[PDB]
């Protein structure tokens, strides 16, 4: 579906039709699904994701005179564009047709209602006007939403437009999907420049990219040291901090050293260098002074208090919680789940170190995901809201420190004193493209984030909403290995559509059938279903040996240890649910089962991703004929015929929708591309856009 009604051979009797010029009743729907990832991401970023972003937003308490004041942001709301104040007449709405005639930004009003209290018994809810945030064109906060092609012609619009862009000074910036490592998945890496991080570090380590509700991202690295010990590197505000593990594990969980150790030796309970190295982690740095959860939190609080910039009246135990909440495993609410996830990433470094597992290439799309326009927008919005709080209360603390009793008279005159901020910062990220942030947003790139979308042709324009940039830093590299066109980008990136000069292999384009996931679902009844299917909870009684069992993960949270002879049936049952839309399994969950043999293959286990930024692509599910959607990592463990008569009985689990599914939208406009040599067809894609 969504690829039915695809023409079988082209026609010419549509031109020369008695109805050629009559504007149609509804828009095309195939052209609409091109910029769909740019619009459905913003729709979340601005309505459902903004509430979550402001919900984290720790209440900004600080000291005034001898008083402590708390300010929390209860809601933030962005309004469609409109004539400034009422100083104008006859039409409140403001349609993108202008700001292209004039040269201006299509910007909506962002306003929040802060709530300031003095010890929690004196309080008043003021509604400040934060600033102006740019708006996408058909984005639910725009005035051209829900307009048929005929009504879209009386406002001067294309009658076939799909916006997915911003108008910053009338220039139509087109923020494009950048490539991120992955989200909520531990990638074991062998990078030789890591041993320079300290005296005894090795070139082994599992990296994790954590994202919470699309508003926060953080990168944490577990490093292996030659002694058998594991360190944890976290970054706060662009500074790298190294905490021995054990300090982290004891803080997160009030458990003995025995159940903890019993956790990091789950699958290798016969190995003795490991058993000895786990004990060195627990005793060597933690029986040295701190043996209760609080003392660990207290010691960790004192060392990190200075650089976490915590409140002075905060106990050290409270400053430790601040570090764990804001720097390690942002995605998981619990501290018990954060412990089990740090334990599986370590259990994996021990397997990479002992050569029992294969390093995950960071440059394979198996271990890659995309950064959409809504993730960048919210992740900047949230950071700027926190900065606004900080600045208003800088002004507060600095003005007078004077008898707030009567000073409740100018409280609004105070908040407005710094509410003059949030507007120009936002336009810089859009007009210039480069990012000025205290934390780089867990991004790794600070330029080329937004680019000009130029309508030289409609094949230059349509390729800005299907571009995927490996990164802007890779344009400066001696080695060329992020330019290799690996066989794992089959159906997800076009082989032919790549710039053919300095940007080659770095700027790719999605195939016609590929698509970005953007929906958000409940995913709460899934952990309770996995247990009905045969999984045994992380708590215990695996029924086997922890080595003949698969570690089940679901979006960063380890459900735990499906038996080895139940993993295949569980994966097939879960795949049948998603295909037939049973249970509540999202139609796009990736049920992956990386089998385990004795060979140094990728680390075994049943993963189940359902996050909102992975690439998926349709394939005709044989044995059901129900048009499944598979992902970049789920496609490596399944056979997908292309033509029929290539389908076999045991082989050919799936089948592809059309034979030319592999090629991009532009590469599908080249006639007979099969009989030309490839450097030519790739050249055709760059010349059709000039």
């Amino acid at each position: 579906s969504r690829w039915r009604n695809l023409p079988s051979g082209p026609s010419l009797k549509h031109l020369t039709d008695p109805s050629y010029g009559i504007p149609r009743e509804q828009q095309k729907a195939a052209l609409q699904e091109l910029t769909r990832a740019h619009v459905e991401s913003f729709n979340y970023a601005v309505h459902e994701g903004l509430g979550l972003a402001v919900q984290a937003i720790p209440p900004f308490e600080f000291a005034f005179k001898d008083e402590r004041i708390s300010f929390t942001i209860l809601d933030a709301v962005i309004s469609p564009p409109t004539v400034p104040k009422g100083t104008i007449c006859k039409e409140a709405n403001v349609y993108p047709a202008e700001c292209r005639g004039r040269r201006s930004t299509y910007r909506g009003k962002l306003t929040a209602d802060i709530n300031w209290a003095v010890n929690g018994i004196s309080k008043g809810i003021i509604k400040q006007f934060l600033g102006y945030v740019p708006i996408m064109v058909k984005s639910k906060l725009c005035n051209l939403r829900n307009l048929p092609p005929q009504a879209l012609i009386e406002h001067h619009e294309e009658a076939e437009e799909m916006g997915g862009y911003f108008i910053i000074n009338g220039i139509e910036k087109v923020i494009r999907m950048l490539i991120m490592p992955r989200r909520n998945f531990p990638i074991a890496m062998i990078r030789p420049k890591w041993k320079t991080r300290g005296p005894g570090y090795t070139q082994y380590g599992v990296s994790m990219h954590c994202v919470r509700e699309e508003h926060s991202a953080v990168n944490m690295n577990l490093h292996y040291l030659e002694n058998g010990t594991v360190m944890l590197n976290f970054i706060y505000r662009k500074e790298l901090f190294f905490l021995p593990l054990g300090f982290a594990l004891k803080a997160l969980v009030s458990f003995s050293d025995y159940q903890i150790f019993q956790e990091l030796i789950k699958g290798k309970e016969d190995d003795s260098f490991l058993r000895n190295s786990v004990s060195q982690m627990l005793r060597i740095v933690m029986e040295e002074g701190c043996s209760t959860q609080k003392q660990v939190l207290n010691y960790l609080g004192e060392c990190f208090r200075v650089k976490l910039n915590v409140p002075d009246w905060y106990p050290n135990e409270q400053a430790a919680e601040f570090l764990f909440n804001q720097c390690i495993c942002i995605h998981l609410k619990s501290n018990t789940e954060k412990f089990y996830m740090l334990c599986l990433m370590t259990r994996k470094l021990f397997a990479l170190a002992k050569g029992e597992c294969m390093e995950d290439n960071p440059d394979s799309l198996v271990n890659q995901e995309v950064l959409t326009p809504g993730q960048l927008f919210l992740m900047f919005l949230k950071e700027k809201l926190e900065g606004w709080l900080v600045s208003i209360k800088i002004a507060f603390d600095k003005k007078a420190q004077k008898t707030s009793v009567s000073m409740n008279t100018d409280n609004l005159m105070r908040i407005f004193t710094m509410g003059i901020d949030l507007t120009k910062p936002f336009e810089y990220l859009f007009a210039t493209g480069n990012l000025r942030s205290k934390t780089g947003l867990g991004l790794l790139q600070d330029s080329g984030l937004c680019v000009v979308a130029d309508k030289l042709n409609f094949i230059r324009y349509l390729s800005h909403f299907r571009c995927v940039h490996r990164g802007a830093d890779f344009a400066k590299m001696r080695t060329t290995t992020v330019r290799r066109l690996l066989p794992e980008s089959w159906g997800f990136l076009c082989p032919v559509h790549t710039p053919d000069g300095e940007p080659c292999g770095l700027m790719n384009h999605l195939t016609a059938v590929c698509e970005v996931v953007t929906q958000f679902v409940y995913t709460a009844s899934i952990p309770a279903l996995l247990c009905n299917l045969g999984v045994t909870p992380i708590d215990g009684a695996p029924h086997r040996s922890y080595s003949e069992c698969y570690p089940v993960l679901l979006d960063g949270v380890m459900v735990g240890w499906v038996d080895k002879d139940l993993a295949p049936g569980i994966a097939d049952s879960l795949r049948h649910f998603k295909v037939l839309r049973e249970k509540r399994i999202p139609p796009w969950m990736e049920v992956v089962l990386i089998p385990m043999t004795g060979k140094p293959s990728l680390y075994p286990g049943l993963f189940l991703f359902t996050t909102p930024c992975r690439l998926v692509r349709p394939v005709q599910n044989l044995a059901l004929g129900k048009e499944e959607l598979i992902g970049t990592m789920e496609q490596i463990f399944m056979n997908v015929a292309i033509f029929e008569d290539e389908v076999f009985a045991g082989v050919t689990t799936h089948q592809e929708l059309f034979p030319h599914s592999l090629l991009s939208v532009i590469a599908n406009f080249i006639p007979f591309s099969d009989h030309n040599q490839s450097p030519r067809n790739m050249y055709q894609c760059q010349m059709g856009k000039q």
């Binding site: 247990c531 009905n532 215990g540 009684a541 040996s545 139940l566």
Partner: protein, 95 residues
Amino acid sequence: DAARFSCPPNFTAKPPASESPRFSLEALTGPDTELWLIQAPADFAPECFNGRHVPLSGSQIVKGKLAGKRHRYRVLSSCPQAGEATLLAPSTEAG
């Protein structure tokens, strides 16, 4: 001195059941009695297995009926693994 667990004021010690002679240590130590630990999904309805012959070894599919709907449950039986949960029973010997 062992800091002795101190019971919070909102909690009270639950007396043993002298009306429970079933989970009595004596009943459980009978030569014809075996104890089994059973783990099931949170939504599992144990009544759906009433009268049915659950296996004591290996793996078997057992069919159950709940609310008119047929359910099939894979049952895995195993040898207790060192470290498994211990059952507590009231004992007259323990005061």
